[PDB]
Ligand binder design. Sequence first.
Ligand SMILES: *[C@@H]1O[C@H](CO[C@@H]2O[C@@H](C)[C@@H](O)[C@@H](O)[C@@H]2O)[C@@H](O[C@@H]2O[C@H](CO)[C@@H](O[C@@H]3O[C@H](CO)[C@@H](O)[C@H](O[C@H]4O[C@H](CO)[C@@H](O)[C@H](O)[C@@H]4O)[C@@H]3O)[C@H](O)[C@H]2NC(C)=O)[C@H](O)[C@H]1NC(C)=O
Ligand SMILES: CC(C)CCC[C@@H](C)[C@H]1CC[C@H]2[C@@H]3CC=C4C[C@@H](OC(=O)CCC(=O)O)CC[C@]4(C)[C@H]3CC[C@]12C
Ligand SMILES: *[C@@H]1O[C@H](CO)[C@@H](O[C@@H]2O[C@H](CO)[C@@H](O)[C@H](O)[C@H]2NC(C)=O)[C@H](O)[C@H]1NC(C)=O
Ligand SMILES: *[C@@H]1O[C@H](CO)[C@@H](O[C@@H]2O[C@H](CO)[C@@H](O)[C@H](O)[C@H]2NC(C)=O)[C@H](O)[C@H]1NC(C)=O
Ligand SMILES: *[C@@H]1O[C@H](CO)[C@@H](O)[C@H](O)[C@H]1NC(C)=O
Lengths: 537, 223
Amino acid sequence: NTYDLVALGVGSTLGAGVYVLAGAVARENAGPAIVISFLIAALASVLAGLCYGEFGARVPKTGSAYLYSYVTVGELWAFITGWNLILSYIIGTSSVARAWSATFDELIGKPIGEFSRQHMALNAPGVLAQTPDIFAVIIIIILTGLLTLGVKESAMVNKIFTCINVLVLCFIVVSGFVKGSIKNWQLTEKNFSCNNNDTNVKYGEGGFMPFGFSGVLSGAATCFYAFVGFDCIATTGEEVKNPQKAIPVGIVASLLICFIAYFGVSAALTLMMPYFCLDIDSPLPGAFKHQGWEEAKYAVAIGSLCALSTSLLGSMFPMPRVIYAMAEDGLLFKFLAKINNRTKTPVIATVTSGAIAAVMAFLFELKDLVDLMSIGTLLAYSLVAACVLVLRYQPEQPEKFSLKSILSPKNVEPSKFSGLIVNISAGLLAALIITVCIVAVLGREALAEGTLWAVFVMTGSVLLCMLVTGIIWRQPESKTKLSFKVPFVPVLPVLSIFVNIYLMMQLDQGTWVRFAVWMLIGFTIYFGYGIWHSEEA
Amino acid sequence: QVYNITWEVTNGDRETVWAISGNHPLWTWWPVLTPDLCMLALSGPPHWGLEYQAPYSSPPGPPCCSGSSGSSAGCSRDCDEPLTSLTPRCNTAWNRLKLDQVTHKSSEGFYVCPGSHRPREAKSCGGPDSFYCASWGCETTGRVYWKPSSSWDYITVDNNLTTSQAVQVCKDNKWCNPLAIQFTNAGKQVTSWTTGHYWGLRLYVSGRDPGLTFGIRLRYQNL
Ligand SMILES: *[C@@H]1O[C@H](CO[C@@H]2O[C@@H](C)[C@@H](O)[C@@H](O)[C@@H]2O)[C@@H](O[C@@H]2O[C@H](CO)[C@@H](O[C@@H]3O[C@H](CO)[C@@H](O)[C@H](O[C@H]4O[C@H](CO)[C@@H](O)[C@H](O)[C@@H]4O)[C@@H]3O)[C@H](O)[C@H]2NC(C)=O)[C@H](O)[C@H]1NC(C)=O
Ligand SMILES: CC(C)CCC[C@@H](C)[C@H]1CC[C@H]2[C@@H]3CC=C4C[C@@H](OC(=O)CCC(=O)O)CC[C@]4(C)[C@H]3CC[C@]12C
Ligand SMILES: *[C@@H]1O[C@H](CO)[C@@H](O[C@@H]2O[C@H](CO)[C@@H](O)[C@H](O)[C@H]2NC(C)=O)[C@H](O)[C@H]1NC(C)=O
Ligand SMILES: *[C@@H]1O[C@H](CO)[C@@H](O[C@@H]2O[C@H](CO)[C@@H](O)[C@H](O)[C@H]2NC(C)=O)[C@H](O)[C@H]1NC(C)=O
Ligand SMILES: *[C@@H]1O[C@H](CO)[C@@H](O)[C@H](O)[C@H]1NC(C)=O
């Protein structure tokens, strides 16, 4: 049964993440040190997964983090989680359509792509895609037509596509270890000449870590989105033979298998061809071509187009479903809630989300969409971790204080006073890790210089973080039995939030601006319309 | 009588990496030597990335896309990207920009310590393994915040170009970390330059303080 749990996890986790991400990271953010970027992103994911195990344990009905938040924590928190999940699905659809279109375009040939270069130009690389992906828009419209018609993901074909994906991954790893050479992890100025006449290349230092540990951290922040999919283990639904013991082993084993796959594939990619000469549109096939195994481009083309499909469909199928769920609850506009009588599907929500994903794929680069999805997913996961941390200390439902009551409560089970102090402590602690990450990222050079203000704020914030975590620790936990519990509930959720926020802070200013605008639209919808028409009103 | 005097600056291997010449009487001509800090690193320690480059070799590395030659095949944009993650070294135009920044930033900098010509009281300073800078107080010159100086060291060392002047020279993919070395009065009275004197130079950085050895020597012939 544990074997089945780990299988479910590996299957649910996207297998197309490395095909599109490996090149973009290994060329723009990390080098061969992407091998390490995948590791950190794995660990950051594991901390999240364990929390999900408890979160899905707190609600007997299986569902998304939206439903769990709405039942447990309330309207606003659930709205924010669902809106982040909407962004994750929409932008994941956009990114996977980008990847699939790029792969097919390179396979068919550049002239097919060069039609866009002839007839279209956004002309704003910084805030707009250097090249619009019209064909990804065509893919998204086709798939939205299929989903509106009622076409649904097929289990058997998905299994077949996952098997072919894993076989091609094994072939890629074997070919990397056969043809690849360690010299590509030791490149110097002597090897800083690329055969193709491609300009504005980011040579960097060269070697194994050309862009430094900050580049490794930015890649890990960008690689966090690839490990998404382990939720299905926490939300398994079926009964488990040893829940709090089988669920965590399954989650960790699935994430370790995914890390092994990504490590092997990125290692092969960065060993066969120089990191700075990687093809962002299609890294793996071009890397094969560089080594003279050009025929392999077809095999990868067979695998990649399958794997990306299993990703795109996976993102596309639930994208309307969250919109429908929120619209029924009144959080989102009711016109999305309506379901066609002919299709028995939420046609309007599917069409709207498809159009948004198509626009995002058209106007924005692959890395921009990737980082926007990463920031949204990291915010959602940090919110889930905070939700578990808070709920562990609230009393089971049907201000002034004293230092003795705060530091040494004598009650054996959570009182409402204990719940309020834990709520306040969680809020203060969240703000304080935000400050810690700000100083560690914006004040990073200031910290290296040892300037008094930066070191003072850092030390004070870290010590007060420890103190707030301790005050949470001192409060009694809920005696309620759960099918799963995060082991170190005072520490592990806090470390999860810390890692998630730091990874978010690694993302570019453009990603933060896009995310801020998205959250602003979400809050405008909620405060202007959602509150008043909520079905619980 | 007037001779063809040549002042030569050599790497740690005592191979000439820079020189200037003039028809002057011996011990009367004391020009400002302007060797590049990167020339001193040719065939030098591995950190600088020039340990296999011969003296007088051209600056290695691909051109910056912002150079006066404009964009070209394989040009780097690292010369425009933030340099915070780069190592201060001489191996690339953007690494030379980072070295220029480190040598110019007030907090960072470089310091120089005397070699064999140091007084015996400086024996504790250490040999070439330490670049004669095993501990603070051995440094006699160089640009750092505490402005070290000596009444007996034979040279003073400073940056030659300002940051703004050096940035464009770096983007052109040329040698762009020129030092300015001036003979002190002690150096002007010293006459052992025929045998050459050697100094160690180390960057003041949050780390191992990478360094190199350089030398100054006089050659002369009839003219
Ligand atoms: C006054 O003296 C200087 C220097 O004297 C030189 O060093 C002494 C120790 C001794 O060995 C002298 O015999 C010797 O000349 C004279 O300047 C040198 O002049 C010669 C030619 O007369 C240059 O020889 C080289 O010739 C190469 C082609 O064969 C040419 O490519 C070289 O240029 C490249 O390399 C030099 C360094 O070798 C570099 O500085 C250039 O920028 C270029 O990359 C070079 O022309 C020497 O290089 C000259 N300099 C040195 C340090 O040797 C000077 O001519 C003399 N004047 C009079 C009036 O006597
Ligand atoms: C799943 C359970 C059993 C173990 C979870 C382990 C994590 C809590 C550890 C493993 C690796 C750690 C990370 C490794 C490296 C870093 C980088 C660190 O920042 C730097 O080192 C910055 C350096 C620079 O300025 O360049 C911030 C914490 C973080 C994300 C660490 C946070 C804590 C992590 C995720
Ligand atoms: C990177 O460049 C270096 C030097 O240009 C290469 O090292 C030489 O490679 C040639 C192969 O043509 C050998 O004959 C030499 O013996 C090598 N010398 C040294 C000192 O290594 C190196 O192979 C290049 N690496 C890559 C991946 O192209
Ligand atoms: C080092 O500094 C000197 C002095 O600042 C520079 O010499 C100047 O060069 C410019 C352009 O050739 C002349 O217009 C000035 O008259 C020179 N000044 C003096 C005092 O000679 C020199 O160019 C700098 N760079 C190097 C490599 O020496
Ligand atoms: C290199 O440049 C030539 C024209 O000078 C061009 O035909 C060729 O396609 C270029 N190589 C590439 C784009 O890989």
